[PDB]
Amino acid sequence: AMNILIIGNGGREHALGWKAAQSPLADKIYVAPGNAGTALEPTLENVDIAATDIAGLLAFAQSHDIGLTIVGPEAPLVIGVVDAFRAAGLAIFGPTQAAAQLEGSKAFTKDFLARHNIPSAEYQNFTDVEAALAYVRQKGAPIVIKADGLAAGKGVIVAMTQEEAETAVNDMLAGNAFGDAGHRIVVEEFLDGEEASFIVMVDGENVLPMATSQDHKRVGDGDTGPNTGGMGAYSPAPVVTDDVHQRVMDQVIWPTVRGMAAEGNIYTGFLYAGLMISADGQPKVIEFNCRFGDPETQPIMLRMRSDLVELCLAGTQGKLNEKTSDWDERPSLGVVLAAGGYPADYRQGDVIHGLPQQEVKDGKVFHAGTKLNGNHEVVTNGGRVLCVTALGETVAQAQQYAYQLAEGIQWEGVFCRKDIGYRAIARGK
Ligand code: NA
Numbered sequence: 001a002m003n004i005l006i007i008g009n010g011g012r013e014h015a016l017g018w019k020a021a022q023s024p025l026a027d028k029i030y031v032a033p034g035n036a037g038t039a040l041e042p043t044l045e046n047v048d049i050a051a052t053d054i055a056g057l058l059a060f061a062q063s064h065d066i067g068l069t070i071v072g073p074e075a076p077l078v079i080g081v082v083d084a085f086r087a088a089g090l091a092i093f094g095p096t097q098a099a100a101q102l103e104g105s106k107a108f109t110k111d112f113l114a115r116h117n118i119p120s121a122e123y124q125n126f127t128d129v130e131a132a133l134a135y136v137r138q139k140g141a142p143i144v145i146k147a148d149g150l151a152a153g154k155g156v157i158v159a160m161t162q163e164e165a166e167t168a169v170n171d172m173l174a175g176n177a178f179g180d181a182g183h184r185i186v187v188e189e190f191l192d193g194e195e196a197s198f199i200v201m202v203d204g205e206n207v208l209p210m211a212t213s214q215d216h217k218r219v220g221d222g223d224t225g226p227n228t229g230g231m232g233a234y235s236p237a238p239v240v241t242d243d244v245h246q247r248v249m250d251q252v253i254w255p256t257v258r259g260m261a262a263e264g265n266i267y268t269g270f271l272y273a274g275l276m277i278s279a280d281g282q283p284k285v286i287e288f289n290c291r292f293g294d295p296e297t298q299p300i301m302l303r304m305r306s307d308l309v310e311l312c313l314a315g316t317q318g319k320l321n322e323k324t325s326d327w328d329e330r331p332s333l334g335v336v337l338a339a340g341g342y343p344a345d346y347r348q349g350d351v352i353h354g355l356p357q358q359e360v361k362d363g364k365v366f367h368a369g370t371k372l373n374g375n376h377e378v379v380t381n382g383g384r385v386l387c388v389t390a391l392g393e394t395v396a397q398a399q400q401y402a403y404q405l406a407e408g409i410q411w412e413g414v415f416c417r418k419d420i421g422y423r424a425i426a427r428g429k
Contacts, residue, residue, distance in 0.1 A: 001027035002067030011368035012297035023309035037367025094269040121189040142190040147172040191276040206320040232420035234333035299332035333398035334389035340413030342383035354408035395424040
């Protein structure tokens with residue numbers, strides 16, 4: 001068996017570590033730095049090294065006979081943890097710094113999507129109110145107008161009528177004409193439809209798709225309030241039909257993987273695509289970003305019947321084309337429990353009461369922003385604190401069970417959406 005290192009401290013990393021621990025191919029499994037959930041997990045050992053301390057991480061891997069490292073979050077990737085590990089001969093599943101630009105830089109990706117003709121939102125920047133008005137007159141509504149400097153919730157206008165679009169442009173650029181006020185807007189195509197997260201493993205040349213999922217990015221029930229990292233997800237996502245899946249692979253995933261290689265930035269690791277699927281079943285890329293992996297990873301790992309270590313090892317050896325993935329036929333669903341105030345300011349340090357003292361059948365509480373202190377109290381340590389995850393025979397039953405398991409977990413200001421899964425439950429799924 002091989003010792004395994006998971007880098008990071010979110011709920012995705014708890015889930016990855018928990019799943020890895022099931023592999024007969026794994027001996028010890030470490031999480032750097034991990035969180036209270038991985039501390040509590042008997043099969044995982046937290047290591048007190050920051051996810052962005054590359055020298056510390058490499059020293060650890062070189063001293064604890066780590067046969068495979070799996071990287072969850074963005075921060076270590078964009079500073080080249082993968083480059084460092086590979087220079088030292090260590091097997092690591094994640095993108096190089098250069099490849100990580102696709103997930104780390106919105107500008108890099110907009111340019112990439114354009115030059116590869118990958119479906120995504122058209123956009124144009126303006127400082128001149130007359131050029132902007134001519135452009136929104138040409139495109140017509142619906143259309144999105146964005147500016148910086150305004151109050152929270154007022155920087156993005158989704159204009160649904162021509163007047164709304166003209167008003168937005170005129171209001172957000174007001175003062176540039178006569179006063180050189182210095183304002184700037186971006187006008188972007190409105191992507192309508194339904195969201196899906198499409199996650200794949202990539203070995204440079206081959207791709208192994210993970211189960212589909214649907215996250216709930218707005219903080220409030222009924223898709224209201226500000227955006228977040230994601231308030232809960234379920235798998236699989238019915239909006240991704242077999243036909244839509246083919247279109248995603250053909251129009252998005254293969255062009256992306258091939259394009260990155262063609263530019264001399266071969267991509268390896270998980271690739272998390274946030275998509276909008278139109279009513280006619282056509283995909284558009286919102287972003288490639290690690291936010292399309294948490295809390296999406298949690299329900300996916302509950303459903304995975306394949307060996308995660310096996311697959312990630314194949315992903316470091318160029319062998320994904322030899323592998324298949326196996327899944328529980330049942331759906332799974334996770335509900336995030338968040339600290340009141342998220343995604344704006346929120347309190348840290350609250351003692352969490354009612355956590356499960358034993359694993360239960362068909363459910364799991366994955367920790368994200370939590371810390372286990374010296375008195376064995378678990379305290380809140382982030383905006384998203386837990387993801388209470390369940391399997392069920394239908395999305396409706398998975399939803400019921402997840403909210404059942406969440407019921408006794410308490411701290412001051414705890415909150416969640418109550419409608420995780422609604423778009424699938426509304427279909428009878
Ligand atoms: Na997410």
